[PDB]
Structure 1
Amino acid sequence: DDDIAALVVDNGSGMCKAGFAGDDAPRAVFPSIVGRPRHQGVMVGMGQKDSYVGDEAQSKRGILTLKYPIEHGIVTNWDDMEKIWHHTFYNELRVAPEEHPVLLTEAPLNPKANREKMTQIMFETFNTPAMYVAIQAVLSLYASGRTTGIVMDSGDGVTHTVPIYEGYALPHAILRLDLAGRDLTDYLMKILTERGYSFTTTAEREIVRDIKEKLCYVALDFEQEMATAASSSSLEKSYELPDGQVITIGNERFRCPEALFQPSFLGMESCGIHETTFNSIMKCDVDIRKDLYANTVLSGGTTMYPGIADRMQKEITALAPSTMKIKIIAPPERKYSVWIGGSILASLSTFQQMWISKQEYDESGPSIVHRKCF
């Protein structure tokens, strides 16, 4: 309150979030959707005001066309993006941007054209006194107190692999995978439907999100687990629906997370994501490979499914040559680790020296962001 609390806006494909410095997690989380007339608006009196940002738009999905301001970690349409920032400060955070400086997150290997322009909008469109751009993968490795290693980041909307050595990400070790958090929620509903439950409208899609944090589990061994499931017994697990019925989930408890590990269930011929992390290591320098195994960090969106840590150890051991130690770094606050890293180092006093200010932008121009980082 007063000095410059630091407003942090975290952007991704979906499930964006924001808060204040000194916090242990972000204050508010909202959906990333924008809607305007679709199918002529659905009948009787069309024209009105339509550009809805937030979860109010989710209900309105049938009558409004949704466009993604962010496609898999990048921004293609700026008009949609501006509405999100307006709505976040004025309606979601309910704090004036003018008193508090804003920090914006970025996807790894973010294109250069976008980087100069986002800075440009903050200074003239919202007149923000200070802002900074950070990488979600860098902060997560940073949070554990380790600068050398490889981080598998489960984003709220997109999953990126970004090995980090001395603050520098490896361009030749980074790959983009599109399954992260929101996509799994779609998937969970899809398999739930197969057993015998009715899902035909986008309105009830949101309901399975609640299901995801409470009921997503990872099995120690998938095939052995499948045999246990057929008998049922204690496998079935209770869940709460707003109406009152409880949808029982038995062998779906472990199978859902498995899609990341085993894409074949989806219908994809693509290699599993854990394997994908392994390819990055193979490409990496041989001498530091042993260090990388002891430097692995799990953070973000859907990594919080219980039993996931146990599964990771097993697959990596099978994938790895052998004869060596594999260690996984597990921070208690892994779900909020991406946001948490950004929040704390934004108000100390010596971070004042380092801020990119509005006044500086006016002088040098767009070129300034490239010049002061490292």
Structure 2
Amino acid sequence: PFRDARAAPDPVLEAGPVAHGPLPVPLVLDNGSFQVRAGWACPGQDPGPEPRLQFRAVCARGRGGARGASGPQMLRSPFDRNVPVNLELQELLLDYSFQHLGVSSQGCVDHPIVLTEAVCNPLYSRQMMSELLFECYGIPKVAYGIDSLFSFYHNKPKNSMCSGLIISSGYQCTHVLPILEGRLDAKNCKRINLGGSQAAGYLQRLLQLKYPGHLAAITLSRMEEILHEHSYIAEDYVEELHKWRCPDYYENNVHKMQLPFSVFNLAAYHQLFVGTERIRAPEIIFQPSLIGEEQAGIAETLQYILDRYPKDIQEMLVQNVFLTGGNTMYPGMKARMEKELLEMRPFRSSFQVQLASNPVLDAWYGARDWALNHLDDNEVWITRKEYEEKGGEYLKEHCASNIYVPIRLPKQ
């Protein structure tokens, strides 16, 4: 059968840690349309033991006058299309995270922080986010970067001017990130508007249409079992759905987990047979025309960005295709990706596909190991005295982070 989810962890702490040399340990925080992930950096230790608040970033409140329902225990979330675009829920999300991390004594957030932002972040959203971060929370200095570049910075061979493609996936997007000598080539980076939410919503809608006996019993929190544990991505899609065509393959390979139980009962508590369906929700990022929506998908975007470039700079970067975030958790992902890439490389040419050491957590460990090294790069971090003149759109172009564009925003 299905399991069910679990909640109410013990992230209860004293007001904060203290470490040798400069005393203020930085906070490391990831945004996330699926889940937020956070912690104190734990500097001077490599085996960073306790990331905390690894929680589904969706909230409510008790409208009868009870409590703010920020943490784990209809619903709203502070992100749209992977960019934060909210205040009235973003506040109680950050307050909840800061309660469990601890604040040292009073009505200001004492320690410096590193925080994730979108592959490109709309100028106004950084303005609103920095305005919350400095008007309300009052942090002394702040750093920004991308989950994908942080998880790459974690998985690099060396702390050097490496180059590659980063392939990223998550709730409402996947992005292809051409990085040249540590610099994101933002003029020819691309994204597809599909990923985890679309795959889960699609797998739901398939089972809603295929099994009209159980229409309220199936829900996204049950789709996540079959999506993250029973599904796999094809090595070649027409080759997998071809071998599903014969019943002797089907009945042996099909997954068959019962609904939660109380005519041989399964007409009410069905095994919800999935065979091609446990491939279709994975394929969405490769063929978005499995949904209605026309976009190139990962294979044609990967080809499209490469033919922007001279043939030598292709060969020296395609040596590091890195897989990270979200849907890259599917079993068989590397074996699909390297086949789709072999089909479009020059005939004898070499390439290598690298999968993250932990495709969900490595963004935090990347930002952590980054902050542990860049701790006193006082030119890199956005300092509170810089936000005292810079309007909140501002960014500084440090390694493993987004590209600033010189610009100014009217606000009153």
TM bin (shorter chain): 0.7 to 0.9
> Per the alignment, in what secondary structure is the counterpart of residue 249 of structure 1?
coil
Q: Aligned to 2:103, which of 96, 101, 104?
A: 96
Identity value in percent: 26
Of stretches 187-196 and 147-156 in structure 1, the one that deviates more from structure 2 is 187-196
Q: 1:277 to 1:124 in 2, by over 3 A?
A: same
Q: Aligned to 1:162, which of 164, 167, 177?
A: 177
Q: Aligned to 1:2, which of 18, 41, 52?
A: 18
Of stretches 25-34 and 226-235 in structure 1, the one that deviates more from structure 2 is 25-34
Measure the CA separation in 2 of the matches of 1:247 and 1:233.
13
> Per the alignment, in what secondary structure is the counterpart of residue 128 of structure 1?
coil
Q: Which runs of 5+ in 2 are unaligned?
A: 1-16, 43-47, 263-268, 400-412
Q: Which residue pairs with 2:119 in the alignment?
A: 108
Q: 1:36 to 1:141 in 2, by over 3 A?
A: same
Measure the CA separation in 2 of the matches of 1:203 and 1:193.
8
Measure the CA separation in 1 of the matches of 2:192 and 2:117.
16
Checking the alignment, whether the CA contact within 8 Å between 2:124 and 2:393 is kept in structure 1 is no
Checking the alignment, whether the CA contact within 8 Å between 1:15 and 1:156 is kept in structure 2 is no
Aligned AA (1:343): R
> Residues 312-323 of structure 1: matches in 2 within 5 Å?
312-323=337-348
TM-score, structure 1 as length reference: 0.82
Q: Which residue pairs with 2:314 in the alignment?
A: 289
Q: Aligned to 1:53, which of 66, 70, 76?
A: 70
Checking the alignment, whether the CA contact within 8 Å between 1:238 and 1:247 is kept in structure 2 is yes
Measure the CA separation in 2 of the matches of 1:243 and 1:134.
46
Q: Which residue pairs with 2:219 in the alignment?
A: 204
Q: Which residue pairs with 1:81 in the alignment?
A: 90
Measure the CA separation in 1 of the matches of 2:111 and 2:230.
38
Q: Which residue pairs with 1:15 in the alignment?
A: 35
Q: 1:372 to 1:298 in 2, by over 3 A?
A: closer
- The superposition leaves residues 241-277 of structure 1 with CA deviations (integer Å, 9 ceiling, x where unpaired) of 5558554422323232112212222223332222212
Q: Which residue pairs with 2:353 in the alignment?
A: 328
TM-score, structure 2 as length reference: 0.75
Q: Which residue pairs with 1:122 in the alignment?
A: 133
> Per the alignment, in what secondary structure is the counterpart of residue 253 of structure 2?
coil
Checking the alignment, whether the CA contact within 8 Å between 1:12 and 1:157 is kept in structure 2 is no
Aligned AA (1:284): Y
Aligned length: 355
Aligned AA (2:33): S
Checking the alignment, whether the CA contact within 8 Å between 1:104 and 1:134 is kept in structure 2 is yes
> Per the alignment, in what secondary structure is the counterpart of residue 356 of structure 2?
coil
Aligned AA (1:138): L
Aligned alpha-carbon RMSD (Å): 3.2
Q: CA deviation at 1:89?
A: 2.0
Q: Which runs of 5+ in 1 are unaligned?
A: 38-45
Q: Does 1:72 align with 2:81?
A: yes
Q: CA deviation at 1:72?
A: 1.2
Aligned AA (2:18): D
Measure the CA separation in 1 of the matches of 2:53 and 2:396.
33
- The superposition leaves residues 191-231 of structure 1 with CA deviations (integer Å, 9 ceiling, x where unpaired) of 23343265544983222112221112122232232233241
Q: Does 1:278 align with 2:296?
A: no
Checking the alignment, whether the CA contact within 8 Å between 1:105 and 1:135 is kept in structure 2 is yes
Q: CA deviation at 1:238?
A: 4.5
Measure the CA separation in 2 of the matches of 1:223 and 1:372.
43
Of stretches 173-182 and 200-209 in structure 1, the one that deviates more from structure 2 is 200-209
Q: 1:280 to 1:189 in 2, by over 3 A?
A: same
Q: Does 1:338 align with 2:354?
A: no
Q: 1:371 to 1:182 in 2, by over 3 A?
A: closer
Q: Which residue pairs with 1:181 in the alignment?
A: 196
Checking the alignment, whether the CA contact within 8 Å between 1:11 and 1:73 is kept in structure 2 is no
